[PDB]
Design a protein around this ligand. Structure first.
Ligand code: HEM
Ligand code: HEM
Ligand SMILES: Cc1cc(N)nc(COc2cc(CCN(C)C)cc(F)c2F)c1
Ligand SMILES: Cc1cc(N)nc(COc2cc(CCN(C)C)cc(F)c2F)c1
Ligand SMILES: C[C@H](O)[C@H](O)[C@H]1CNc2nc(N)[nH]c(=O)c2N1
Ligand SMILES: C[C@H](O)[C@H](O)[C@H]1CNc2nc(N)[nH]c(=O)c2N1
Ligand SMILES: [Zn+2]
Lengths: 418, 414
């Protein structure tokens, strides 16, 4: 057992759930890597098709956990299912998840996402089974429906769409986009950058793939879909499905004249979903934004939109030195605008005070019913106003549970074309 | 066997070989990370003290490029002679200064480490009484405060012997305001220090029962009962907090002290334990302005400032707390600069610390850092340490925590 204390309320939780931890965190008792982006390459099976003694033990574990979840350990259906995975693996070197197993594993991957502040909602995920897809066109149909359903005219709903699992590796389904909706980034001739600088390499892949770019600041990027390992394919998301919020300020009338907007749907599309030894290399999932993701990081990182110096000018701020806190002060007004805009257009959005409060409650709930909750303090603490949110003063144990979401290399580094 | 760290903003990559040296446990395991735990997990005999001593002397003579030398080998023999016959040994003045400087340098949670080498070390190992401790500490303060041009300093008192004759400063910092719990449940002054205020009052302190009463020193020498001493007012530099734009801000009546002086930590060198070792530098703005003034368990002036800003304090998505918080830290920096009291803001400090980190990688092979503590408690993302990965390990000499003296001391009067 390992206790965790809240240094603001003195609540102490007692974690036993960590004992079911399978993968290495990256830490040793002599060195802590809690601030490394990807601390560990400890996967669960070799990079392409594993052998029977490699795959079944992972499969046996998940099926065990799922039947144990529904209070049917060792039942008729449980024992039959193991034997069924046994024969599938025998004759296909893989196995196929039942519909309910798919939904259980997808929801529980979200649940063990040690980095997601927005997990109090985990069991309310909508799972779209796309395991029957065969082409990039079909991938585009599935994604498009995802976006309509999730967006819900602004009343956002969490959803994941799950494309066929990895087989041998040279037949992967991928979304080459990192998120379903991102603006483009163009390397200007004078060395500067128009649009979103994180997406310059991807914006150039799209150009070199055929995309006519409008060469602006908020060009929604094309989807770039790969099916069954083949060459990826450009599709344009119908604009009427890309709900966008223009950013204005509840006080500074001049703010709208900055011509800033952002998209209302955050949909991570480049990660890998891992259930019982199976690897779903294409599993786009979406929810709704915490304000700070847009207004702190997207707008105010140096390597991102860097609107800070611009907004500070209009604020008439002494930018001669740092000790004036002109960056701090504009950062707040920006994140004030971003919130007030989304709420004004009735687009779902949550502020960092409301969401962190929820996660404290979610930790309670979890510790009380599950015996723990994995939590990555470095990522949970919002990137502005850290200590005036509850999460800051909350001790967090971090450990890796399966099912889970895993990083994976960008498909263009590992894809020989045709 | 190297370990790399990346800055996801600049994309600089640093190679850490220093982590091999460490031998003290972080608290993590291979399957759980304890990087957000505030505190993870009588005194040492002869046999534990030999290697620790050897370790330290070895690393010291290496730093002065004299490893293997006659002076190195004779020192070791001398150190063993002492432990062999008194179960302890005594650091040289050179080693004491080296050790103290490196304990700071090795403080993975300190962002201000770029100045580690400029420490002024005051040896107080000859002290024997609480009055002696008060004298030494008063000199510390006058020196460190330096009429506002603050200077880093440490004062090191006699080492632990049997855990029964221990010097301690009961004070957690050398200058802290007092806090009193009122009948009605309201709290006057600093609520952090309420329990310590009660300990003092009980021991004879006659409190002014105001909002900013400098507490007294509660000084323990040689394991005896501690003793009360009032720092001379003329040595406590204080800053009245005003705001460059908001005229009304002075009326809040806030002030803060100028000298941050940590006193309840243990300094560990060569297996020796220095249980009283107050140290001091200057302040980063956020330590007063975010945590001292705006934590809920503390002075909690957020409510009061936002009223005097006419902010909408109903819903949270108005970000009134964020907005007031910036202003309070604008005020705490402006106030110090005007009175020409040394202070660094969180932008400048993080900036410097990245430079420090990079230099420490070059010359030394790494630098242990605790991203949880290095990232400031406001505007984290727009400081460069946010985008900087950091390896964390425990190098000795180090500053450790120790239990609060009032939990473990056994009294003697009447
Ligand atoms: C519904 C509202 C949600 C909110 C407000 C939210 C918020 C966040 C935030 C702030 C992060 C930190 C990373 C960053 O700042 O970019 C994060 C990480 C993450 N979230 Fe959520 N999220 C939500 C829903 C979801 C859903 C629906 C899923 C999957 C079904 C998910 C899975 C993840 C994963 C995998 C990570 C990162 C883990 C890693 O990098 O190892 N989140 N989330
Ligand atoms: C000179 C200017 C200095 C600045 C601006 C500075 C700043 C900081 C800050 C912000 C922290 C985080 C702790 C908190 O916020 O509560 C810290 C921690 C720390 N400082 Fe420094 N500091 C300075 C000098 C020193 C000196 C002179 C020493 C000792 C010789 C020292 C030893 C430490 C230690 C040991 C910690 C870590 C506490 C722990 O591990 O729990 N610092 N410092
Ligand atoms: C569903 C959802 C909702 C929401 N409101 N926010 C998010 C943020 O999702 C992620 C963001 C990053 C950025 C990491 N950086 C290296 C680019 C990495 C991940 F693994 C994520 F899952 C997701
Ligand atoms: C010399 C110096 C300068 C400076 N500007 N700041 C500091 C802050 O050092 C510490 C602060 C805390 C606060 C931890 N909280 C529970 C109250 C605990 C420690 F052990 C520290 F060493 C020191
Ligand atoms: C170096 C550091 O680990 C890195 O910048 C992390 C810090 N914490 C984060 N927290 C969130 N929510 N998102 C991030 O991308 C990061 N980046
Ligand atoms: C629970 C968590 O570890 C705790 O609130 C820490 C986080 N980081 C911190 N960082 C600093 N500088 N000071 C602190 O007191 C803390 N508190
Ligand atoms: Zn760790």
């Amino acid at each position: 057992f390992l206790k965790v204390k809240n240094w603001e309320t003195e609540v102490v939780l007692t974690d036993t759930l960590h004992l079911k931890s399978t993968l290495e965190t990256g830490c040793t008792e002599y060195i802590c890597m809690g601030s490394i982006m990807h601390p560990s390459q400890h996967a669960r099976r070799p990079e392409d098709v594993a052998t029977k003694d490699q795959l079944f033990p992972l499969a046996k574990e998940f099926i065990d956990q799922y039947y144990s979840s529904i209070k049917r350990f060792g039942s008729k259906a449980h024992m039959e299912r193991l034997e069924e995975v046994n024969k599938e693996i025998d004759t296909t070197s893989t196995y196929q998840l039942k519909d309910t197993e798919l939904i259980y594993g997808a929801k529980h991957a979200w649940r063990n996402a040690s980095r997601c502040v927005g997990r109090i909602q985990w069991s309310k995920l909508q799972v779209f089974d796309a395991r029957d897809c065969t082409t990039a066109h079909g991938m585009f149909n599935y994604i498009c429906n995802h976006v309509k359903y999730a967006t819900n005219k602004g009343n956002l709903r969490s959803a994941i769409t799950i494309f066929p699992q990895r087989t041998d590796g040279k037949h992967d389904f991928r979304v080459w986009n990192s998120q379903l909706i991102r603006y483009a980034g163009y390397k200007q001739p004078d060395g500067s950058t128009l649009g979103d600088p994180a997406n310059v390499q991807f914006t150039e892949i799209c150009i070199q793939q055929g995309w006519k770019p409008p060469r602006g600041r908020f060009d929604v990027l094309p989807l770039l879909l790969q099916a069954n390992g083949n060459d990826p394919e450009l599709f344009q998301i119908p604009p009427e499905l890309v709900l966008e919020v223009p950013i204005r300020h509840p006080k500074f009338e001049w703010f709208k004249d900055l011509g800033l907007k952002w998209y209302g749907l955050p949909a991570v599309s480049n990660m890998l979903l891992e259930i019982g030894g199976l690897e779903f290399s294409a599993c786009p999932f979406s929810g709704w934004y915490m304000g700070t993701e847009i207004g702190v990081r997207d707008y105010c990182d140096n390597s991102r939109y860097n609107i800070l110096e611009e907004v500070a000018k209009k604020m008439n701020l002494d930018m001669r030195k740092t000790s004036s806190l002109w960056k701090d002060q504009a950062l707040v007004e920006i994140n004030i605008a971003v919130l007030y805009s989304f709420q004004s257009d009735k687009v779902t959005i949550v502020d960092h005070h409301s969401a962190t409060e929820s996660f404290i409650k979610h930790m309670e709930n979890e510790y009380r019913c599950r015996g723990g909750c994995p939590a990555d303090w470095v990522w949970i603490v919002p990137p502005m106003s850290g200590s005036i949110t509850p999460v800051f003063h909350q001790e967090m144990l971090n450990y890796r549970l399966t099912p889970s979401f895993e990083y994976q290399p960008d498909p263009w580094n590992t894809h020989v074309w045709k």
